[PDB]
Design a protein around this nucleic acid. Structure first.
Ligand code: U5P
Ligand code: MG
Ligand code: MG
Length: 672
RNA sequence: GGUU
């Protein structure tokens, strides 16, 4: 009655290979719950994706499901803003379809709370069916049934969908676990960990058995296999409270007017061996996940913060890259090899910046830092000349304290020139590792590419920029976009450039890890970095891609054996998980950031919090999305509530109200 | 996108 009956695998599976139906995985809009699409590559079709707009078109399918779709007649296709499909695609149309069936899966339980509307609509005896609101907004509300609504009101629950009948406007399901109270820090972190499928259990006894037992020390056997650099002034430069030091650097005068620079990375592969429980776990996690109030390390704590970590005044192993630069800052020598180092100081970015800028400081570390700063400044200019994108992101530091429920302060992270110096040096080391490894193993090198933006990606944003400042963004090359981004300036508002440099990050494709045999040498290109070949080598403590590159670099030099990296399915499955786990760890981090911003705003509960500048960043049929740079929060405001819908990129004054829900507004323009 |  409300939906068309689904088809049986009898005609579903035949139709897909027949071509009468197309098959793909459902991707639902993070903004709109009832708007999806299937991306893929079908036979006899020029298009890369089919839209599934509406509840009737999505036919009860959930995000992630493997749906079978039937194309709507080309007359019903969605344009840019009886015919042939090719005629329609030439006039910029997008294919449209209706979900005709689903492929059974282990569809995850969803974290969330009972929909507050249902709690307000009620004021209990017996069993009652009520609506559950999954935290994931791509998932519709599920109807659950409990005889203890009272004991569940304030709880975070996990719900599994059981079915969605042809006549029900919502699917039915049931709760499988009570995770805790809504608002609880540990429950809200468990929600984030579960929603992003983060493995976060303690390491097994098998994993801890892989660590070195007893008092750890550098051995004479290993020293006779390493370049001993312990007499060199090596330092590390990291954020505050960083116990995991992945890289350290040195710099000195050599051969008259030349400079030697080493980038010394933690020798994780000395402790982490292939085929062990520890490596099996590190491979699965693939990356360390960082939350506001906690972190889920890829490797055990003993390695992370002690034996691998380049700790100051402790002898440590390392896998170093070294270069000799001439007067023109051109490399005259390059060395990859295993070393034994001893960091003189584990510095914080600001301390390094003060040291460089203090005229009274003539210490070996201060001088080395000035040299690395000089050299890095040169690398940044060559990179802007190359066409590298210089984009912006906002990260907040949350001031927590055991005596307060909510964080007492929220400020942006501090940035110094030493932050750019470390970035340049790591970008330099990773690119040297990429080239060196690829010279040895052209058919299975773990690399990192970034495709150029999709077609018409900057259209919407360009309509607004050209309207406001008379400029357009040119994505033909990395260099053109970088030069046109430099011209994106509003003379009456200095934030405009940083805002555009932030919104342009949302128009780019995700960068991906890959085996060098998947594509041609020209497809190795990193659009964002304007580089022909790139990889991650500098963080094996917190990234498994780096572990694989350190392995391949040792086999490239012949100081280790080659592994079966070699098996095609295996090297392409390795990249696949690196990409999945990387994405989930990014969502987990952003989720935790939003969480703590909500907790900070709880300090002004039922109180009046002052109004800050905001910008119109998105415009749907129904809502105006406003970004408040001060808090890094995006508000959703209904067009029905406004005297006039503001234009895209308009700088408005945003009213913020805490009623535990956050309400946004535009100071002027609200209907009374 | 990118660095720690
Ligand atoms: O994705 C990341 C990577 C690193 N860090 C921060 O960077 C610091 C530098 O250490 P590392 O984790 O990069 O080795 C860490 O202490 C941590 O605070 C993050 O917050 N997120
Ligand atoms: Mg580090
Ligand atoms: Mg690191």
């Amino acid at each position: 009655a409300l939906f068309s009956p689904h088809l049986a695998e009898s005609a579903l599976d035949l139709g897909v290979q027949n071509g009468t139906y197309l098959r793909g995985k459902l991707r639902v809009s993070e903004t709109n719950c009832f708007f999806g699409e299937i991306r893929g590559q079908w036979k006899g079709h020029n298009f890369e994706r089919v839209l599934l707009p509406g509840r009737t078109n999505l036919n009860r399918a959930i995000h992630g499901d493997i749906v079978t779709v039937e194309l709507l007649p080309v007359a019903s296709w969605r344009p840019l803003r009886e015919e042939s499909e090719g005629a329609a695609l030439a006039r910029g149309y997008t294919p449209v379809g209706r979900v005709v069936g689903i492929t059974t899966m282990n569809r995850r339980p969803f974290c969330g709370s009972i929909d507050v509307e249902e709690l307000n609509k009620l004021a209990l005896t017996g069993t009652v069916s009520v609506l559950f609101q999954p935290k994931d907004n791509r998932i519709p509300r599920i109807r659950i049934t409990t005889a203890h609504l009272g004991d569940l009101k304030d709880k975070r629950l996990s719900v599994i969908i059981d079915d969605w009948g042809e006549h029900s406007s919502f699917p039915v399901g049931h709760y499988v676990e009570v995770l805790g109270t809504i608002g609880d820090k540990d429950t809200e972190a468990k929600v984030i960990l579960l929603e992003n499928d983060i493995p976060h259990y303690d390491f097994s006894e098998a994993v801890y058995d892989c660590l070195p037992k007893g008092e750890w020390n550098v051995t004479e056997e290993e020293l006779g296999n390493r370049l001993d650099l312990r007499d060199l002034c090596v330092v590390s430069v990291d954020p505050l409270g960083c116990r995991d030091i992945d890289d350290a650097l040195h710099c000195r005068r050599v051969n008259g007017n030349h400079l030697e620079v080493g980038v010394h990375i933690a020798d994780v592969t000395h402790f982490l061996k292939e085929g062990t429980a520890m490596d099996e776990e590190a491979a699965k996690r693939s990356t360390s996940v960082y939350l506001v109030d906690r972190r889920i390390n890829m490797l055990p704590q003993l390695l992370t913060e002690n034996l691998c970590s380049i700790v100051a005044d402790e002898d440590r192993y390392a896998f170093s890259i070294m270069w000799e630069f001439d007067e023109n800052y051109s490399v005259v020598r390059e060395f990859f090899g295993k070393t034994v180092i001893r960091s003189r100081a584990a510095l914080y970015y600001g301390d390094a910046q003060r040291m460089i800028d203090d005229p009274e400081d003539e210490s070996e570390a201060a001088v080395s830092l000035r040299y690395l700063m000089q050299l890095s400044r040169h690398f940044r200019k060559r990179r802007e000349k190359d066409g590298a994108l210089f984009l912006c992101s906002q990260e907040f530091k949350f001031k927590v304290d055991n005596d307060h429920v909510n964080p007492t302060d929220m400020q942006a992270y501090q940035t110094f020139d030493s932050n750019s110096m470390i970035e340049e040096w790591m970008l330099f080391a990773n690119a040297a590792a990429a080239r060196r490894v690829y010279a040895s193993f052209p058919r299975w090198t773990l690399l990192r590419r970034h495709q150029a933006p999709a077609e018409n990606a900057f259209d919407t944003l360009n309509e607004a920029i050209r309207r406001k400042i008379g400029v357009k963004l040119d994505d033909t090359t990395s260099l053109a976009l970088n030069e046109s981004l430099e011209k994106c300036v509003d003379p009456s508002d200095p934030y405009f450039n940083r805002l555009i440099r932030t919104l342009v990050t949302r128009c780019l494709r995700q960068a991906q890890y890959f085996s060098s045999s998947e594509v041609s040498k020209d497809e190795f290109h990193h659009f964002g970095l304007a580089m022909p070949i790139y990889t991650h080598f500098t963080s094996p403590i917190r990234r498994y891609a780096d572990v694989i590159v350190h392995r391949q670099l040792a086999a490239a030099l012949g100081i280790m054996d080659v592994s079966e990296h070699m098996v095609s399915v295996k090297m392409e499955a390795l990249a696949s998980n690196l990409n999945y786990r990387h994405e989930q760890a990014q969502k987990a981090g952003r989720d935790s950031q939003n969480l703590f911003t909500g907790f900070y705003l709880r300090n002004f509960a039922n109180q009046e919090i002052p109004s800050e500048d905001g910008y119109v960043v998105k415009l749907s049929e129904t809502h105006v999305f406003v970004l408040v740079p001060k808090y890094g929060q995006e508000g959703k405001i209904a067009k029905e509530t406004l005297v006039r819908v503001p234009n895209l990129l308009d700088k408005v004054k945003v009213g913020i109200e805490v009623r535990a829900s956050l309400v946004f507004s535009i100071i002027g323009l609200m209907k009374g």
